[PDB]
Design a protein around this ligand. Structure first.
Ligand code: FFO
Ligand code: FFO
Lengths: 417, 416
């Protein structure tokens, strides 16, 4: 008879202290990591439910364990909302993460060794888009594609590569690209060589949901996304599709299970279901608008201050700052901004002379501060403080000054009130 | 963003289903070997704000900033994991058992390498070479099962190993009730220079209490989930002892960036607190009751004329072969379910039916034991089960048994 009153605080102080500190860090820090956000207490409530106890392999109605009557309802809710929010006729809510959702798509449509056309990591592509240190690069033959000297994808060259290499699948998506991708144009290219157009919209799923970024669902054979980025939900993966055949969806369901996973996390899926409902609110649509809007405001300031912004601008929630001409490593910038309570993340840039762990740039995202209340005014001011730090990266007095400024604004905009 | 936000007043549908599951867990006798009831402390962790942090990499070498406290959290889980099992290496980031196993494969083998693993119908897990799983699709699998006696024949295993010269031998199971000789498997591996990979997901809890042979000191690499007999959150875990810096390097890379992205820091916090609870003395006597209860149910089943694979049990579970009773696991499962007794259809050795239908059921005592049941209650439960199986079409029999379960269930509430 476990007691509902059994808590962590009085049982494990070590773990407890660390947790509480993270709770405060999230309040005293300006999070500018593009892939992060602040999920609602409703999503956390779900994740902390008793649904963590149930084993439910299979799908609603076709499980491999008994007693799945209510978890079946839960999973169905997540599936239906997912389809309605994105306009798909197929959705799989069991992938444990973005990597897992992507892994499923690979194993369901390709054979080890097949050729895949994906966006290079330094140019903005994700690890699972063909990186040699990831399963994508080890199990398949990858042909990369990057961006112009203008900072955008050259669909003319992409087409050439496609025609010359005849890839079995073309991957559209990114982790660090600030432009707008022409989904329809990539589908055209895929169709000309009979390839699959697989789009990973993890980073822009939220913006797409609000209608602030082109929806790829109606142009790709298969789409994947995480639920924890701009979508602002729990950490998890999701597979979506529209206009596919019974077979394709059967393959996709098999790829997830028993293909690459065991039992799903019913408590996390409950959270996905509630987050997908929150993404349906009108306030959610104006929220994404502020996100893109704030992103543009920070870019202006960075350019006015003499900083190189890859692609010259932004059409989404993020942007890259190339620090090569400033003789700074992303690792240095990241660490300096951190001491001022401004959290970003070192990021490789196109033609980066440094390795992924060091990099010559930093990636910035507005989803967190926007969800926190910030607007153009606050964002322009924050961008400014950032450049102040970068400008005098060795001046502890400058960093000190800024630190107090952020602690001050962080207090007026509590994350969880 | 207001802390007062909750599901009840915002999403009545989701809330209603959740609440029902909450009651189902109280009104049902869960006998699914892979399930349990995690403490409210583990749930508390999983519902924390740690779900907001992205922390790729390992403590000290992350790819994002602001990982000072999540680094402390992950270290706690790693240290406790090592101390509880006696390993000098532990990886707490795998999202699940499948993911932990996938890492071990990709870190030690090349697509197409030969692997010796236990056949699924004979008790092996999907990730141990099933053709419908990545293990069976990416590697060359040679299976091995059990005797006519119900146990592994280490003599035949050795023969298979010498003849096929596999690059890795897998020890572990999802539905075997015996004791595996880890040292003996390591002997066999060594003779052909193969890797001995042991997946102890099902018996991690028993091992922790010292109730089942610990494989850590005999295998090159060990994996386990944290949500079965260990009674923690749903997740994976990699353990190793006596390996080299190279091997651990590979293992860390296999998990990330090899097969995963960011870990679930909130789940890892839960792993950390569950591994501390597994250190309690009450936890050791708990596993003892589990194994003990398992034996008590087996006796009754045999006395009632039911075929129990392997003739008995040396752990938390056992299989009931229903072929001679002309019943499918799917039928038994459904019948027992209407009596509020939840089990799961399970393939048995030489099963004439497919995995979705099966000719048997698997039974586990971890849940009811953690719930308070002891030999007396377990013998009585096993009895009711046989009553249902005996008269599987008698709705009057099933109803009477449902009244009995609801009753004993009210006397042993799960969460209070
Ligand atoms: N373009 C881009 N930016 C991104 C991501 C991405 O996938 N693509 N990430 C998405 O999450 C994060 C960065 N994650 C990375 C993780 C590992 C390696 C990597 O290549 N590691 C190699 C070599 C490292 C070294 O320099 O020593 C390795 O570990 O072997 C790179 C990026 C954030 N920024
Ligand atoms: N021995 C054993 N028992 C176990 C498991 C296991 O891995 N091994 N499981 C561990 O979690 C659960 C069963 N999970 C399974 C999931 C899928 C298939 C399977 O082979 N499905 C095929 C064919 C199904 C059919 O009969 O139609 C498929 O989907 O293609 C089998 C078992 C519980 N019992």
């Amino acid at each position: 008879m476990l007691k509902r009153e059994m808590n962590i605080a009085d049982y494990d102080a070590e773990l407890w202290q660390a947790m509480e500190q993270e709770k405060v860090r999230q309040e005293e820090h300006i999070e500018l990591i593009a892939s992060e956000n602040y999920t609602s207490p409703r999503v956390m409530q779900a994740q902390g439910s008793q649904l963590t106890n149930k084993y439910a392999e299979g799908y609603p109605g076709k499980r491999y364990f008994g007693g799945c009557e209510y978890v079946d309802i839960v999973e169905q809710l997540a599936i239906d909302r997912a389809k309605e929010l994105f306009g798909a006729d197929y959705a799989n809510v069991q992938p444990h993460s973005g990597s897992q959702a992507n892994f499923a798509v690979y194993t369901a449509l390709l054979e080890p060794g097949d050729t895949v056309l994906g966006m290079n990591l330094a140019h903005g592509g994700h690890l699972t888009h063909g990186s040699p240190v990831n399963f994508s690069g080890k199990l398949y033959n990858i042909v990369p594609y990057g961006i112009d000297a203008t900072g955008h994808i050259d669909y003319a060259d992409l087409e050439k590569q496609a025609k010359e290499h005849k890839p079995k699948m073309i991957i559209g998506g990114f982790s660090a690209y600030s432009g707008v991708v022409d989904w329809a144009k990539m589908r055209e290219i895929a169709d000309s060589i009979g390839a699959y157009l697989f789009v990973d919209m993890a980073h822009v799923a939220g913006l797409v949901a609000a209608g602030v970024y082109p929806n790829p669902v109606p142009h790709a054979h298969v789409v994947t996304t995480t639920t924890h980025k701009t979508l602002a939900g729990p950490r998890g993966g999701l597979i979506l599709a529209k206009g596919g055949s019974e077979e394709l969806y059967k393959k996709l369901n098999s790829a997830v299970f028993p293909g690459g996973q065991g039992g799903p996390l019913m408590h996390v899926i409950a959270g996905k279901a509630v987050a997908l409902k929150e993404a349906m609110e009108p306030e959610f649509k104006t929220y994404q608008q502020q996100v893109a809007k704030n992103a543009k405001a920070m870019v202006e300031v960075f350019l006015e201050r003499g900083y190189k912004v890859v692609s010259g601008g932004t059409d989404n929630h993020l942007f890259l700052v190339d620090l090569v001409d400033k003789n700074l490593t992303g690792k240095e910038a990241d660490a300096a901004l951190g001491r001022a309570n401004i959290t970003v993340n070192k990021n490789s840039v196109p033609n980066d002379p440094k390795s992924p762990f060091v990099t010559s740039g930093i990636r910035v995202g507005t989803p967190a501060i926007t969800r926190r209340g910030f607007k153009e005014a606050e964002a322009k001011e924050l961008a400014g403080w950032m450049c102040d730090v970068l400008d005098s990266i060795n001046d502890e007095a400058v960093i000190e000054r800024i630190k107090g400024k952020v602690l001050d604004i962080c207090a007026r905009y509590p994350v969880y009130a």
